[PDB]
Every structure is written in C-alpha cells, then in structure tokens.
C-alpha cells in the first residue's frame, strides 16, 4: 500500500503507454522506406585545418552566418575562427580551464561557455572598447554544466550535472524556470527550430521533451541501454536523434511517441560523442571514440562514409546553417572543415 | 587579397604569438587530481565547482585539483597522477573505500594514470589497535588468521600489533592494483598523519618516478 500502492498505479500506467505505443506501430519506417534510391558513397575531404588550440577541444558551435565559428579547449581559451580564411577573430581567455560546452548567440553579439565551475559565463563580443568582456555569470546550478544554447540575446537554457535543466534571463541574471524529472546527469540539449520546445538526454538512458513556456515535461523516450551522450533535432522539428555509449544512434518521433530507426553496426563497439543532421535531414553525421565520424543514411540506416582525419577522440561536431560544411573537433587540438 | 583582409591576418598572427607565450608557460607544471571521501582528511595532506591549490617543491610547480558515477573523470585524462586519500582509522567504511579504489583503478579513461595512495590518519589507527576495543577481524575475516607481517622492514618503535594492522590494510589496496593494469600504471602506497609535513616531498618523489618510467617506455629504452 501507500507508495507500494502508488507503485502498482505507476506500473499500470507504464504498461498503458507501452500498449498505446505498440498499437500505433502498424509498419516500420525502415520497411516503408525500402523503395527509395540510396544516397551513394559520400566522400568528404578536409578543406581546412584550424590550428592554435594547445589541448583537447571539448565543444564547438557555428555562427548563424555559417562563416564564424567558436571553439573551446582545456587551455582555458575561447577562439573565434573565420572558417574561410582560417583567421582568428578573437581569443577569449577563461577564468576556469575546465570548460565542457560553448555556444554562439543567434544574433552574433554573444558567446557562452561553462563547465566544471558550475557557471555559465556570457561574453560581449561587440564592445566599444574593442575587446571581449564577460557580460554576466549565471550561478545556481549545483552540478557541472554540460550544455548551453541561446534562444535569443536575453534567454539561454543550460543543462547541468545536477539532473536538471534551467532557463535563464540574462538581463536579470536569475533562473526563470527549472526542468526536473531526469534521474541521471543531463549531458546534451537541443533547441527546436521553432524554439517553443527542446529535448535533453541524460545518463539515465532517457530523453525528455520539454515545453519552455509551460516548464514541464511533455514526453519521455526510453530506448537506449547506456548514457545518452549526444542529442540533435531533426530539421523538420518532428523527430530527433540520440547517440549513446552503447555504440548506437536512434531516431525518435515526437508525434508517434515511439522509436523509429536504430543506427548500429557489429564492428562498432565504442561510444558516440556527438551527432548532427544535414540540411535536408537525409544524412546523419555522428562522431565516435574510434577517432573518426560516420555518415548514416537517416532513412535507410546504412553507412555512407567515414570522416577519418583525426588521430584522437572526436569530441564535437557541427553542420552549418546552409549545409555547406561540417566542422569536426577532436582531442588532438585540431578542428577540420569537411566538404 | 585586399588591404582590409591583409590587416586582419596581421591581427590573427599576433594572436598565435600570445597563444604560445602562455602555452609554453603551462608545459612546465604538473597537474594532479585529488580524490577521496569526506572523512578521509582529503584537504589536509599538503599544508600549502572545483577547488585548486598550488605548491612548489624543488622548483617544480604542482597543480592539485579537488572537485567539491563520475562522468567528469574523463576531463582528467592527461593528469600526471591521481591522489587517493583513505581514512584507515575506521573499518566500517574501509570496505566502501576499497570499492572506491576499484572503480578508479579499472576505469576506462584512467588506464595509464598512476595513483599515489595516502592512508591518512595512521595515528588513530595505532590507538585503535593498541588500546583495542575493536577487531578488524569482525569486518575483515581474513585478518583473523592473517599472516603475520611478511618479513620486511618495519618502522622503529611501532608495536608488532600495529605493524600487523598497517601491513594488512596496505595489502588490500595493492591487491587490487596488481590484479590488473598490465604494468601500465603503478600504485604508490603511503602512511600519513594529520601533523605530517613531508607529504609534499612524497608527491614530488612519486611523480618523478611516474614520469621516469613512461619516458623510458615511449622512448623504447626499456
């Protein structure tokens, strides 16, 4: 009785969701898409290599103009790159060298960073003094900072290692809402194209869909076996991809509320560090611990290429907003633009 | 190129100059990771989000990083050594300290990182076994018929009962360390106290031997 009684109600409700998910599975997405021509053999070559970081690169982000790019490393320095002329626009020294994430404002006036210091620091790129100064420090997260993504010049959302995600207001500096429900540490985050929702995978092998305005969880997806290290959102906004430590990518659908595809191979045994889609959503670029990235046919679950140019762990991965290039960072202190 | 893009590249080149002035200044320091429990006396071995303490011995700079499973332990993949502090006085929590040591030794990312083990509070261990009132045998059944201290060098003035207990606890942590690893990393066990000032020398000597046997290995001298 009591909690145990409530335990029977929780188990009964869990079976109802599973029964409803099984009812809608009239056909498999892989079975349905067995009528389209394959994407062929994707062959990408590293156009440029960005040098200057002196330790492992942990995060990277593309500007909305698809030309500027920010990266963070364990030196304690943020470098903004001109991805066309391999020029260093800025070099922002950080107070703490233990930084695991970095972001770029959609307007382009700000960058964010955070890590083991449990603080998201926001830097003003465009100041009258000609330098880069820190604008605000967002404190209130108990654990480390795993991800941070801007919604606009005043709103950012941070996922933390205290099993929570938070929405901040930079003008006030205070936490507006908090997103609770994850059991393990949240490791990734992905804002929807319409920005009204976002998704976050955690170490409890689950991914939750949140509503930013309401502030509570909408759907919960459980198909993985280990910690979900990376998450990314489909360009349409009705699906997302999860990359976990069990050497497998998965594709979940928001409307169907069910898993759609599994991206696995028997000769891959290492974890997945980063995932990203393409402009059309047909490709799925995912970095691994075996020092190279894989290109997956997102509709056919077949490999289509290998981005083998790094001699250490590929830690970050990003695709431009026009789909022209793929930037790949790794623990060998090198960033490579692929095309 | 144009006169504006030529001047932009001159600014970029100056950035790489500053990226190497401080980058070359951080290659002469050794970064250590401090691990342990709350009752271990973790932050009292060296008397000098994430905390950091700096100390220098024999003109060598040391950076000790104390935080506060461990998903952030992969950030310390390139540290010189791991410092694990154990409270050997109490035996109720000695079993969870051994399982504490097992996860770090058999970690996937720390397979090449050596561990300097400080069995802290050895003063209260002597009082707990001389005045008795407790029996490791209760918590560790092997100590009931534990081999007497294996013939070896003991510390002068220590009682035979104290040296029997000290050698038993130190043997548990080296049994885990020698079971696996295949010689890629070595555990260095020490016995400290709360009024011991020599723990800076011991870290210096252990890191000197840590670097020496991997310099000889990657140069294929041994």
């Amino acid at each position: 009785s009591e909690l145990d009684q409530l335990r029977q109600e929780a188990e009964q409700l869990k079976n109802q969701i599973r029964d409803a998910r099984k009812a809608c599975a009239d056909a498999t997405l892989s079975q349905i898409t067995n009528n389209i021509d394959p994407v062929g053999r994707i062959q990408m070559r590293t156009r440029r290599t960005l040098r200057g970081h002196l330790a492992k690169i942990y995060a990277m982000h593309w500007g909305t103009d698809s030309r500027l790019l920010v990266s963070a490393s364990q030196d304690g320095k943020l470098i903004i790159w001109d991805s066309y002329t391999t020029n260093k626009v800025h070099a922002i020294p950080l107070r703490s060298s233990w930084v695991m994430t970095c972001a770029y404002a959609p307007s382009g006036n700000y960058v964010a960073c955070g890590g083991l210091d449990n603080i998201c620091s926001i830097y003003n790129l465009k100041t009258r003094e000609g330098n880069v100064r820190v604008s605000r420090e967002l404190a209130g997260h108990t654990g480390y900072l795993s991800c941070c993504r801007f919604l606009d010049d005043n709103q950012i959302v941070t996922s933390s290692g205290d099993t929570t995600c938070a929405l901040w207001d930079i003008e006030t500096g205070q936490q507006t809402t908090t997103f609770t429900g994850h059991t393990g540490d949240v490791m990734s985050l992905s804002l929807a194209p319409d920005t009204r929702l976002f998704v976050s995978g955690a170490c409890d092998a689950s991914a939750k869909l949140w509503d930013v305005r309401e502030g509570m969880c909408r759907q919960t997806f459980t198909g993985h076996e280990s910690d979900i290290n990376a998450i990314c959102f489909f360009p349409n906004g009705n699906a997302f991809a999860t990359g976990s430590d069990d050497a497998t990518c998965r594709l979940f659908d928001l409307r169907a509320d069910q898993e759609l595809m599994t991206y696995s191979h028997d000769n891959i045994i290492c974890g997945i560090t980063s995932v990203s889609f393409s402009k059309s959503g047909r490709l799925l670029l995912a970095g691994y611990d075996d020092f190279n990235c894989n290109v997956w046919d997102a509709l056919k679950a077949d490999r289509a290429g290998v981005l083998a140019g790094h001699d250490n762990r590929v830690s970050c991965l990003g695709v431009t907003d026009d789909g022209m290039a793929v930037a790949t960072g790794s623990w060998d202190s090198f960033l490579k633009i692929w095309n | 190129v144009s006169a504006e893009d030529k001047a932009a590249a001159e600014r970029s080149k100056m950035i790489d100059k500053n990226l190497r002035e401080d980058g070359e200044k951080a290659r002469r320091t050794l970064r250590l990771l401090l691990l342990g429990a709350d009752n271990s006396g973790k932050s009292t071995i060296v008397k000098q989000g994430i905390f950091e303490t700096k100390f220098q011995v024999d003109k060598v700079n040391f950076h000790m990083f104390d935080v506060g499973r461990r998903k952030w332990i992969q950030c310390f993949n390139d540290v010189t050594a791991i410092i694990f502090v154990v409270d050997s006085s109490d035996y109720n929590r000695l079993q969870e300290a051994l399982n504490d040591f097992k996860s770090i030794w058999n970690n996937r990312w720390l397979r090449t990182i050596s561990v300097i083990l400080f069995l802290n509070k050895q003063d209260l261990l002597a009082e707990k076994v001389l005045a008795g009132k407790s029996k490791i045998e209760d918590y560790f059944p092997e100590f009931a018929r534990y081999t007497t201290p294996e013939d070896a060098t003991p510390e002068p003035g220590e009682d035979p009962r104290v040296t029997r207990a000290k050698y038993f606890i130190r043997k548990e942590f080296v049994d885990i360390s020698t079971a696996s690893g295949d010689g890629r990393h070595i555990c260095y066990p020490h016995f400290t106290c709360a009024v011991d000032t020599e723990n800076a020398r011991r870290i210096f000597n252990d890191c000197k031997d840590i670097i020496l046997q991997m310099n000889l290995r990657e140069y294929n001298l041994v």
Partner: single-chain antibody
Amino acid sequence: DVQLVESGGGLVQPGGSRKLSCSASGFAFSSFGMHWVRQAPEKGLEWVAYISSGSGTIYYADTVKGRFTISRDDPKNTLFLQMTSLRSEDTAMYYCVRSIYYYGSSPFDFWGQGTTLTVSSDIVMTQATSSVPVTPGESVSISCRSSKSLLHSNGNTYLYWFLQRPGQSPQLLIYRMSNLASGVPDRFSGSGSGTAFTLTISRLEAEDVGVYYCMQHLEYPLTFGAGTKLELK
C-alpha cells in the same frame, strides 16, 4: 568614455621640425591600428600615415614619405608623428583615427580633435555636387564616383562615408558601402555598385548638415572625396 586627446601644433617656422602626439584613453589602445588624417583650411580630408597594432606595418602618403615618421607607445597609451623639413603646404589640422581590422569590424570609428599646425596609379574619388541647398524634412541623395572598381573578389565593396559637422571632427556613419555604424540611426542608408555609389538620407531632421566625404579602403594610399556641403535654407 573613448577619448583621443591631441597635443602639439601651433605656429612654427618653415623648414623646421615639429612632433605631434595624440593621447588615447577609454579603449584598448594596443589592439587598434591608428591613422593620421589632415584637413587643409580650404579643402577636404587627406590621409597622411598609418601604424598598425604592434607597429608591424607602416604606410605613408607619397607627399610625406621620407620626411614624416609615425610611431606609437603602447605602454604609455599614446602615438607620435615626427614631422621634419616642413613646408608651407603642411598648414592643416591633423586628426588621429583609430581602426581595428577583423571579420565584420568597422574601421575609422573614433576621430579625435585636431591640432592646428601653422607653417609660416592612385584611385581618385569624385563628387560632382559640392553645395546643395536642402530643406528640412525632405530627402536627398549624395553620390560619389571612383576611377577603379572598389568591389573585391571576396564580395566586399570598400567604400566609407563620413560626416563633418561645422566645428566638429568627422564621424563614420556608413562603412563598406552598406553597413550602418553604431549610434547612427536608420535614417541614413548607403547603396551602390561598382564605381557608382550614393548615400540616401530620408526625413532629414536638424543636425544633419555638414560635409559628406566618400573614401576608398581597397588599397593604400586611402583617398577621400572632395565633399558635398549641405546648407540651411
């Protein structure tokens, strides 16, 4: 906050030597390239010299090369212009202009006040209009012409617009022929193409009068336009 305080100047004899210094405060002086621009008493602006960040690159006008020298003192937050073998054609007012060069930066933001010196294969910029009467509240367009195509192979058209109010140092309003500077309202709009440019002002309010200078930044030396004065009715 930002200030470029000038020093020196005055009446000097011809054939002598004078040193001009411009003191900088309120910004990171070490990361800004600096320029010297003079204004004749009955003419427009004229670029003189240029020193980069770290003094790694120096450019001179062909009319001052060999007798003028530009240097900067980063720890002291000041720069100097050594002027030797003066003549009667150097009587002008010398401005110190800061300029920073990276992707998306706007050079020629802040112009200091001038020092009144009283000595007792180039792209030309052509502005046919020189004096135009403009009624308040109306809209006018001021054009400029070039002898060479300012559009580069990277897609950047290096044309700049400045406004010298009567009795004040000129200020940048449009840089690279399309981008509005910070603090300049949306009233000003710049547009053009290769060897053809214009500056459109809509709903001309007060304090919009003065002289408008077009400038090229495609190659050194940088040449200014003659100017287009605006007068009240």
